[PDB]
Structures are given as C-alpha cells and as structure tokens.
Symmetry: D2
Subunit: 386 residues, 4 copies
C-alpha cells in the first residue's frame, strides 16, 4: 500500500518514515514543502530516499503559502489570544492539501504526518485532509507507535542507521516558533541567543530605520517603492524587521485540545505588516465597518488556530473580511527601532480623512442635537429611578 | 443664576470663565480636579478667583480616578480601534460627575465645560451630566460663542486681564494626548521633542529593566513587591515605563461625531499594565471565557470612547468583565527596553497551566476520537458536494 | 428652486405640498411610489397636480422593492428586537433613492418628506438621501413649521382647499404597521377590526392549509410549484398567510431617536417566508455557519431599523449573508392554521442531513475521545479549585 | 466497586443495571429523579431493587430543576437554532450533579448513564460529571457493551427477569421531545395524535384565553395574580398553554457530535414564559442593553445545548444575563388561541415607556442635528467615491 508522508527531514519524521515501512510494509512517498524554513529542501528529499522512501517530492510553495494562506488571513486581522500571529497555524492547511493531492496522484491509501498527540497540528492536518478527501486514511505515528521517551526513539533511530544528534522549533516564511523544554516554565525568560530570525533588540541598529509598505485592495504589494511578489515581499520585510528585532511574542496560550502551553514566536515581517495594514485601514475603512470587523477577527483567529481553514464557517467569514479589505489601498510609513514598530505616517488615494473637518460639512450646533437625542434614553432612565 | 465650570486654569477655560459671567451674568463656581496633569491645582483655584469666579474648588481626585474609572476599564481589556488606551475618555465622566455634585451642593442650575463642538469630550461631559441629573442645563461656550479665530480670543483675553502666552495636549495620570496643528497631516511624523511623559527611546537606558506587577482579583496591587494604592501604583509604573520611552502610539481614529482625527498618545504605566494583565490572565482565565471576553472588549471600548460610561450597556458589560476579572490573581514579569515592553514571565497561585499536560491528561486515542467527531460535518459536506 | 416631495396623497403630505410652495417659493415635484399599499397611486398623482405640484410622478416599484430590498434583508434573517420584520424600515431607502434620482433628473436642489420629528422614518429618508447625494438639501416640514395641533392643520388645509376627512398606518407589500392613538397604552389590546391585511384568526378557515415554498440560492422562487417573480410571490404568500391570520405582532420597541413606542404589525407573507427560509437552511447550512449567522442577524436588523441601508457596515454584513444564503436551495412545506404557521416538512437537493448518522461515518468510541478532550480544561479547573 | 446509575425505570436502564453488576463486578446504586416526567418514581425505585440494585434512591427534583436550571436559562433568553427551548438540555446537568453527589456520599468510584454514543445527552452527563468531580469514572454502556441489536437486548432482559414491552420520547416539566423512527424523514409531517402535553390546535377551545404572568427581577412569580413556586408555576402554564396547543416546534437541528437530526418539541409553559418575559423586557430594559443581550443569547444557547452548563464560559455569561434580568419586573398579558400565544399588553412599576415622548423631553429640531452628525461619515464616503 502507498502512504504519502509529510516529511521535513528532521529526526522524528525520519524515524517515522522507517516506522511506516516496517509497520505497514508500505511504499512511502515522502513530501517536503519549501515554505521558507531556510533549509535546502532538496537535502531533505535525498535523505528521505536514503532513509527508505520509494519516492520523494520537494516543492517550492513559498508563493502559494503567502498568496493563498498568509495574505487572506492577514486581510482578516487575525490574532489569537492577543498576540499570536498564527505562523504555524496557517501553514498546516497548505501542507495537508498537497499531501492529499499527492496521495490521489500516486494512488496512495493513506497520508501521514509527524505532529504529536498532544497538540494542535494533528487537528490541523487531519481536519484539512478529511475536509478535502472524506474517504482518506490518516496515520499519526505519534499516536500509534509504542515508543516511550527520547532514548527509545534514538535507539530505534541508531538501529536503522538514521543520523542522531532545549526546545522545539517550527520555522517558515511567516515566523519561527519555539516551545517545550526550558520554555515549559512560564516564569522562566527564554534563553539568550534562542532567536534566529530576529536580531536581539539590544544589538539592533542605533539609528532608526523607516520603511513604507504599499497595499492594494487589501494585500501588500510593495516595500519602499519596490513591487514585490507575496513571498518576496514577506521575505524583504523579514529582513528589514529582523535586523531591528521586531515581532517577538512570549505567551501562554490555550491549545484546542484543552491544555495551556508556553510559546515564543518571532514574526518580523508579519508584525510590520500587521501595523502597516491597520495604518492604511485608518484612512480607508469606515468607522462602523472597522468596529464590526475587529469584533470578528478573534473568531476567525481561533478558526485558523484550531485548524478549520477549509471549513464553511471560515470561508464565510472570509467573504466578509475580503469585502472589507478591498478598500484597503494606500501606503503606511513605519519607523523601526530596537524591537519596536512605530507607525509614523499613512496616506491613501481614497482617504476618508478630511483635515477641514477637524481644523479651526460640519456645523457646531448639530452636535447639541446629536447629544440631546443620544442622551434621551439615559435621561428617561434617571427620571424613572426618580 | 449659578454655573459650575470645569476649570483647568488654562487660557481657554479662563476666557470661558469671563465669557460665562458676561453672557449669563451668573455666579461661576470654578472646579479644578487633580487627576495627574502634573499641575498645581491650587494655582488654578486662585487664578479662577482672580478671573472672577465667585467660588473656586479644587479636589485631589487621583485615587478616585484610578480606582473607580481607570481600573474598572482596564479589567475589561478596553482598547479603542486597535491602539487607543482611552486616557482622556475615562477621565471626563469623573469630572462631569463632580460638576453635577457641586451644582447640586451649590444650588447651581447649570454646568459648563470647555470642550469644542468638533469633538468627543463634549459628548462625554454631557451624556454623563444628563445621565446623572436629567434636568441639569449644560453650557458649552465653544458651541455658543462668536470668536472667529485664535487672534480674537487672545484680544478678548488681554482686553479682560487674562494672562496670554503647534498642537493641543491633554494630560492626566493615565496618559498625555497630543492632536491638532502639525499633527493634522497623517503623513507627518510628530515633531521631535513633543513627548513629555516618556523619555525618547533613543535616550533611554542601555540596560533593560525588569518589573513585576502583582494582580489581585483583577486589579494591580503591587510593583516589584511593594504594595501601592491605585494612583500611587499607576504613578510608579509611569515613572518606570516613562524612563524607558514605553507606551507611544500614533493613529488616525474615528470620532463619535463622524470624522477621522490624527491622535498621538503616551501611556507608559497603562501600557505596562495592559500587558501585565494579559500575562496573568494567560494562567488564570479559561480558554472559552477569554475568547468571549476578547470579542466584547472592543464594544466596551467604543462605549467608553463615545461617552457612555454612566449608561446601562456599559454597566451591564462591566458585570461580565468584573466576574471574569475576579480570577486574575498572580504576577507578571516584564522587561522594558528602549520603547518596548516584553512579557518574560508569569506565575499565579491558581494557575491553570500544568506542565505534565505538555511534557513528553488523556491518552493518544482520545485525540483521535476528538478529531473524528470534529471532522464529521466537514466530511458530510465534502461527500454531498460529491 | 425645485423640491421633490415624497407624496402619498394623504392630508399631511398635501398640506406639506402647499406649505413647501409658499415657504420656499418653490416648484414642487410630487413623487408617489406604488410599493403595495393597496391604493391607486394614479389617484395620488392627480390629487398632487390639483394640490399644486408643478409635476407629479407615480411609479410601480413593487418588483424593485421586493427584489432589491426585501429579499436581501430576508436573506440575513433580520428581525428587530425579537419580532419586528421591518416592513416599513426597508421601504424608506427605496423611496429616498428615487427622490434623489428624480431630484437629479429635474434639477431640484432639495427633496422633502412627511415623516415626523419623533420617529425613525426621518432618519431613514435622510441617511439614505445624504449617503447617495452628499450635498442634497432635505426639508422635513414637521421639524420646521409651527402648527400647534391637529385643529390648526385642518384649518390650514381647509383654507387651502385641501379636502379634510384612532391610530396611524403605513402599508406596503411586506406589511401594515399600526401605532399611535389608542395603541399608545401598552396595556391596551388593539381594537377589534383594526387589521386589514390579515383575517382575524378567530374567523380563519376551519381547515388548515398546506403551502410549499421553493428557494433557489437564498431567495424564494416558487409557491406551490408555481414560479413567481419577487413581488408576485410576496403577494401570493400575503393572500395565503393573510386568509389564515398569520403574521401578527404587538410590541413596544426602542426607536433610534431614544423613546419606546408601541407598534402592531401584520406580515403574513413575510412571516411564512421567515419560517420557510429557516426550514430549508436547516438542511443546507453548516452548523457553525448557522450559529455565526444568527449572532449577526440582530446587528443587521438594527442597521435596517435605524436607516443605515446604503451604509458600508450594512453592505459589508450583506457580503457575509449573501455568501451564506447562496447555499439555501430547497423546499419548505408549512401548515397554516388559525393565526399560526407550522413547518411540517423540508427537502433539499444538497441536504446535509443523513439518516445514516442518527439511525441505529460514525463510531461511538470516537465520542468518548471527543468528550475527554472537551472536558480536559474543565477537569484542570476543578483540580485547581481543589 | 460501587456504581451510581441514572436509572429511569425503563428496559434499557434495567438491562444496564444487570450489565453493570456483572461486567464490573460491582454493586449498583440506582438514582431516579422526578423532574416532571409524569411517572411514579417510587415505582422505578422499587423496580431497581427488584432488578438488583444494592440501594435505590428517588428524589423529587421538580423545584430545583425549575429554580436552578430552567429559570437561569430563561433569564438569558436562550433559544437554540431559532426554535429549540432546550427542554432536555437543561435537565441533564441537574441529573449528573446528583449522580456525583450520591457517588461521593456512597463512596462510589463511578457513575453510569444510558444515553447513546451518537447523541448530545452523553456529553451533557459527562461534561457535568467531570466538571464537578474530575477523578470520577464514567461508564456509558452504549459505548462499551457488545449487544449487536435490539433482539439480543430483549433476550438478555428476558433472561434476567426484566419485563419487556415509532419514535422515542423525553419528557419533563419543561417539554416533551420526540425524535427517531418515522420522524427521521424531514419531509414527513409527524403522525396524528403524537403530542401528549399539548392538545391539537384543531381541538383547542374556540374561546381565546387571557393569562397574566408577573415577573420579579427576571423570574416569573405569579400567574393571574396567584403567587406560585417555580415548579408549580411552570406546571400551571403547561396546563393553560397545553389546553390551547401552544408551544409546538418541528426542526432539523445540529447535534454537538456533528450530525443533523429531526426533532419535534412541545413546550407550552416555556413558550408562554418566553413571550411573557420579552413583553416585560420591552418596558424594563434599555435599548442598548437589549440589543447586546440578544446578540449573546444564541451563544449561551449552544453552550446549554452542547452540555457546558457547569462551565466557566456559561457562568460568566450568566453573570451578564442575571445583571440584565434583574430589571425585568412587571406583568405580561397574553392571549392564547389555537396553537398561538399573542402578547396583548404589558405594564411595569419602573416602565421606561413615556406616552409623553410619542404623543403629539423632546424637541424635533434636536433630530436634525442627530441626523446630520450620524450622516457625516456617509457624506464623506460619498464625496470620496466622487
Ligand atoms: N515544510 C514541511 N514539509 C512537509 N511536512 C512538514 C513541513 N513542516 C512540517 N511538516 C509536518 O508537520 C509536522 C510539524 O512539526 P514540527 O516540525 O515539530 O514543527 C512534521 O513532524 C511533519 O510531519
Ligand atoms: N483637571 C481638570 N479639571 C477641571 N476641568 C477639566 C480638567 N481637565 C479637563 N477639564 C475640562 O474639559 C476640557 C478638556 O479640554 P482639553 O484639555 O483641550 O483636551 C477643559 O476645556 C475643561 O473644561
Ligand atoms: N408610497 C409612497 N410614495 C412616496 N412617499 C411616501 C410613500 N409612502 C410614504 N411616503 C413618505 O414617508 C412618510 C411616511 O409616513 P407615514 O405614512 O405616517 O408612516 C409620508 O409622510 C411621505 O412623505
Ligand atoms: N428521571 C431520570 N432519572 C435518572 N436518570 C435519568 C432520568 N431521565 C433520564 N435519565 C438518564 O438519561 C437517559 C435518558 O433517556 P433517553 O431520552 O431515552 O436517551 C437514560 O438512559 C438515563 O440513564
Ligand atoms: N511545536 C510544534 N509546532 C508549532 C506551534 C505554535 C503553536 N503553539 C500553534 O499551535 O501554532 N509541534 C507540535 C504543536 C501543537 O500541536 O500544539 C506538535 O506537533 O505536537
Ligand atoms: N484634544 C482634546 N482632548 C483629547 C483626546 C484624545 C482623543 N482623540 C479622545 O477622544 O479621547 N480636546 C478636544 C477632543 C475631542 O473632543 O475629540 C475637544 O474638546 O474638542
Ligand atoms: N408611523 C409611521 N410609520 C411606521 C412604522 C413601523 C415602525 N415602528 C418603524 O420604525 O418602522 N410614521 C412615523 C414612524 C417613525 O418615524 O418612527 C413618522 O414618520 O413619524
Ligand atoms: N432522544 C434522547 N433524548 C433527547 C433530546 C432533544 C434534543 N434533540 C437535545 O439534544 O436536547 N436520547 C438521545 C439524544 C441525544 O443526546 O442527542 C440519546 O441518549 O442518545
């Protein structure tokens, strides 16, 4: 039987490829997606073949990732529990999508992934798979094998000749996530030198740096006047924001499976894009549209976090967010300095701001009437209380 | 006829004090509240007497301000349009409340304030006034007078004996607001040296400073182990954060009155408290409670911003927020560095975090069933689309 | 100067026509719309010319009314304060839309309407007018003249040759509204004989009547197998629901301008449609989509009620509702009997219901896992309470 | 080993009692609760002993049911998916609460119930149990045993001495639920004579009946002037409403475990109470409070439906609803007639309604300013769209 494995190249997914051959005596098709992890995915592909894969596929999905997953999510202003910009979250749907497509192309029965039984990833992979191919068979080795502990897995690794070696990392174009190990104690600061995408604030330039991001109908299309594709644009902002230490988050979040866990994230480019968008929105979105939009963002955020990307409720909300984002066209000017992102300017060809309405269509006495009417129900209330 | 005026001691409320006397020929009781503007209010009380007030009152309302207004608001995680911590907004209700109490005490049928006809403050003072005493009369000189320029106001000031002297500011224990003049161009960065409460990040300490804030049942009670009263606590955090340049935001916001306005704010202490609270909340609040609470916060924020403090909607929402906030007990440890605030740790007596649930609360198979049930409707959907 | 008046042919708008001519020395162009009031609008168009209009326009807007206003609103499941199906609310935008178009075509700088200064209609008319043509001038005589009472208005009309003839009515294809007069006492049942669109349930047929309503992509397209245009369809359902006394509501509502008002409404066809729609949705909409949709309906309803039809917030929500409603294709079967409507059956081409899953893919063991995971956070909370 | 079983006295729970003793080599303590199912609970209690229970407990929980579960839910205006008044949903928590208490008193390590593995009840029972006593062991025979059909179940019972006897029913003081069998076809009207709690509208009195319900701080306290305890009050309204065939619902709902199912419900008393409460609320609740409250009700409804009664989200929302409900004091007057409930009058000690404001403080010109300000952002938008 054929099985398509989401293969990263790491120890665990390598142990999984061997485990699947041995346990299911199956023809394993390894799949590695280049989504900006900063690893030569071609090395993962050869290592998979070396580890026993009857086939290995490596694809550059950086553009699809940002264009079809990151951008739509950003248009919605999605933020989980106040700080998480969902770097790992929106990536999983993309990977499961291809796993399913590859399985259908290679006539494979099942697909497998290496997310553990304690997290959100397992849900994201599987909900995506079932939503796309309801008849698909899914295998989650972390839930199915008998290994108990790192020593056993390493022993098993060495036995099969698999290359063996504080926290665990998950990286892609949007961010790098860190959790586990020393990070499991919520009272303990992350260890110095852990971050990789972002330079330390204390080591960031002494001179602030200005950057401008242009948005067209809800999506960023240029940086400092240079038109850049979705992936190239995220990359560029990662470089600029990274040098300044921008986008570090440290939170204890609530997993979908029920328990809290301490996660640390660095999202330089995405963080710049979060504030740039709101800056352009401040001139281009209507007050009531904005207030409504912000009260829905958190719901869309948990949908992404839990793994309901290819789910009707998320696609429905997307219709709202996409409609609203269509008006977001303009430029945000931000000032980067030692870990912070400061909005310092913004402009738009169809700005709703009118200096003439605030400087010293507006008649001062209309305000009295507005106030009296707004006050009526409160006055009736007070009088009734006598 | 008696009129109680919200008197700050500035040129405008000074001009207003004279204007009221001439216009209404009423005795004016000047009221000056110390809410942390960093001004000697007795100086304003005496100047009010020199300007013609038949009675000048000055009260230290710092503790009432933080305890009965800033704290209840903070418990709700109130943030207007993404960044505004409502520094000016929660202050007006307090002032109006005293204006109405004093009018009742002095037998004054009317109150007056110096907010302009183009803004939010006018609504805040008046909705509060009418909500507390329905038949009170309110006079807003800015909406009633004839001055057609700043030049005319000063001439009137000099012609009357009032001392006369790029943007307008409003300061109190929570923040300092800056808007108008040079700030009316949303593409222009605020002028160098404008900020007064926070030190320029470029001139802030080279070594980060750690700070710990203790929360008890939703309100902050100690800083670095020192128990502090509400106003004392906010003051202490303003000093610590200010020294580091923390809490600066720049936005184009939507006034309740219809038009957009470019505002700049520095909220050092409040910004530290915002993040400290969420840090403690991450260990003490249930996932679902939190998610629901966060979707209501934006609504509570617009209520405070529009001026509906003493309104049934806000008091109802307050019951919800207060209920949830009651569990927020613990300590947040934050790191301050050149303009930025970083959560680096948190602990709590009744933390819901359990390392054993994440360390390598259910067994693997449980997750499989959870996923299958969660996936059911998506699979039926896919099948029907057959 | 020219003024386009929303003229219904009644006493008040006739008085208004005369009043406008003299007060503004203007040419008044009368506009009467047939939106299902059950009155020969041509008679109103002629009475206007007799009354002094320089031009009188009358249009059959029944189809545009149902297709472009009633249907989009019904797709959203809009219900104001638990019962009001907004019959008068969605009709005002339509009227004002034509007033502004006619004003433009005739070179008129202003439009006028006869809604009083204490209601919602004035807001709906003007918000629509201003939103479509920002510099249009609106004249609301009720807020400008000084008639001291009814007697005075009758004498004015008698003096102008206007024919002078216990509650006020507003009728159209969607419903008939009743309020004012004897209806002002919330404790008093409406008088017998008041209803006109519906038969007293006590006089309704002794046998129940079954009716089927087919929906296609969110809108009703057929009744009892007969395909019917929007307006013809609402009419047929009015006839059917009407004969049985269906659609009667009696509520005390909150007007946008601040005071409560007692209103009585009969919406036979719309009431059948409300339940028919939900019946088809019960087979075609996903659970999460439905739940989110229902939490937004109320907001949409107040938007309509207040008059924000041609408003970006409303249009944005409409994007969401339209997206969801595109899945609503199927047939609802209802049973009508003495005042009530009963859903007794429903079917759909792409129904999501599967008897497979309820009769004795699904494995009961999965339910245990689902339950354990959902319970984890509750159990942790319990252990911490200790 | 001791196991406390939710014992209804029926065939399946009797089979379960025998099954539990042998499978777990344990003694079973049967618990039967009278919650208004209209059965003699002492009969089930005696039968449990005859079936082998080591102890059988039967309690009258009618008052606790209505006072502590039904009323709190009603104050929230809870309605699931447009029509379900949650009759079975709110009863389960109460039952499980007692199972856990009895287990603790009897020193039993586990509890058991007879809900199936494909429904909602299992979740309600278990989430409740786990929330109250996290270490409790729950046994759900339907998800554990090996019976492969109804005939084998009958053979097992007949073999154990248990006596053996088109849809399934669940009845209590709030309603009677009907689902399964012939009701599984959503296009088929339910069978004649199926309803038990309500008289068919065709047979109901030709004379309408007026009923008055007095509310005090959110809860109903009297019917037609007669003060009644919670359970006696619900009983009374069931009798009155039942005679008139009030409260019948026919829906295809979404279960928490993922699939749709056709359910039929009769809730005579609860339906009168639903409309009675809203009638009193129309005079006692503020507009904004009401609108907010209605947007949260559906969320609370799904919580109850899913089984999250003793859950922090639900208790947090309850704080909101209870705050709001406290103003709900007054009397509702309804007209009952052949299946329908018509609100015909309402009054309250502190009614916020003022004939003052609608009859022909308020000055129409305030309305113009209100409208102008409300329209500003719309005019700005229009001008920009040019
Ligand atoms: N770039 C990728 N290509 C293919 N599969 C991936 C990729 N990144 C993650 N996965 C899968 O999802 C899991 C994610 O966990 P982790 O690598 O610890 O962050 C891995 O164990 C893989 O099975
Ligand atoms: N500390 C205070 N005491 C009394 N009235 C105040 C105080 N702060 C503000 N106000 C009132 O509210 C207005 C606020 O204006 P502004 O400072 O320009 O943003 C002043 O014109 C006063 O009438
Ligand atoms: N069919 C119609 N055509 C034109 N204007 C109308 C029509 N129906 C109502 N109006 C306008 O809106 C107001 C509605 O008032 P009313 O009937 O008292 O509820 C009238 O005073 C008219 O100015
Ligand atoms: N009055 C009651 N006393 C004790 N247990 C009950 C009672 N009503 C329901 N239950 C439990 O919940 C299930 C309810 O029945 P059903 O509606 O047939 O799925 C039974 O299998 C019992 O274990
Ligand atoms: N650490 C890791 N990746 C990423 C995550 C960031 C995060 N807290 C999230 O849920 O996105 N591996 C896990 C995370 C998880 O499922 O919670 C696993 O496979 O079990
Ligand atoms: N500048 C000033 N104070 C403060 C406020 C910050 C802000 N944008 C807010 O609404 O709180 N004066 C005004 C503000 C206003 O009313 O919007 C006035 O009286 O008109
Ligand atoms: N009675 C009338 N029409 C209709 C109304 C139904 C209702 N309560 C609504 O707001 O739609 N005329 C008024 C209503 C109002 O503006 O509230 C007026 O023009 O003054
Ligand atoms: N029919 C019955 N009881 C009640 C239900 C009304 C309903 N649709 C609801 O979920 O409350 N038995 C089931 C229902 C269920 O829990 O979904 C079972 O034990 O499996």
């Amino acid at each position: 039987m054929k099985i398509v494995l989401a293969y990263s190249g790491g120890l665990d997914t390598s142990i999984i490829l061997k485990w699947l051959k041995e346990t299911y005596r199956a023809e394993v098709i390894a799949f590695t997606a280049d989504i900006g992890q900063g690893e030569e995915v071609e090395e993962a592909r050869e290592k998979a073949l070396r580890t026993g894969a009857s086939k290995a596929i490596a694809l550059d999905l950086k553009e699809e990732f940002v264009r079809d997953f990151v951008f739509p999510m950003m248009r919605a202003g999605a933020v989980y529990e106040g700080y998480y910009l969902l770097g790992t979250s929106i990536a999983r749907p993309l990977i499961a999508k291809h796993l399913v497509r590859i399985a259908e192309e290679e006539g494979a029965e099942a697909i497998a992934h290496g997310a553990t039984g304690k997290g959100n990833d397992q849900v994201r992979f599987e909900l995506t798979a079932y939503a796309l191919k309801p008849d698909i068979k899914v295998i989650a080795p972390w839930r199915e094998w008998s290994f108990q502990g790192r020593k056993e897995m390493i022993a098993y690794a060495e036995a099969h000749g698999i290359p063996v070696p504080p926290y665990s990392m998950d990286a892609n174009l949007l961010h790098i996530s860190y959790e586990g190990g020393v990070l499991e104690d919520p009272w303990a600061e992350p260890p110095k030198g852990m971050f990789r995408m972002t330079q330390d604030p204390e080591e960031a330039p002494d001179a602030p740096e200005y950057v401008e991001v242009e948005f067209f109908e809800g999506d960023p299309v240029a940086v400092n006047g240079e038109r850049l594709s979705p992936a190239a644009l995220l990359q560029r902002l990662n470089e600029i924001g990274g040098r300044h230490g921008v986008g570090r988050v440290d939170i204890v979040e609530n997993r979908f499976v029920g328990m809290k866990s301490r996660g640390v994230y660095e999202t330089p480019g995405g963080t710049i894009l979060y504030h740039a968008r709101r800056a352009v929105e401040s001139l281009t979105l209507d007050r009531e549209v904005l207030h409504q939009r912000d009260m829905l963002s958190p719901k869309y955020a948990e949908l992404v976090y839990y793994g309901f990307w290819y789910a009707p409720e998320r696609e429905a909300l997307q219709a709202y967010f996409d409609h609203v984002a269509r008006s977001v066209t303009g430029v945000a000017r931000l000032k980067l300095y030692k870990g912070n992102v400061y909005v310092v300017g913004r402009k738009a060809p169809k700005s709703l701001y009118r200096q003439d309405l605030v400087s010293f269509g507006y008649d001062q006495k209309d305000a009295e009437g507005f106030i009296k009417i707004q006050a009526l129900r409160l006055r009736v209330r007070a009088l009734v209380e006598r």
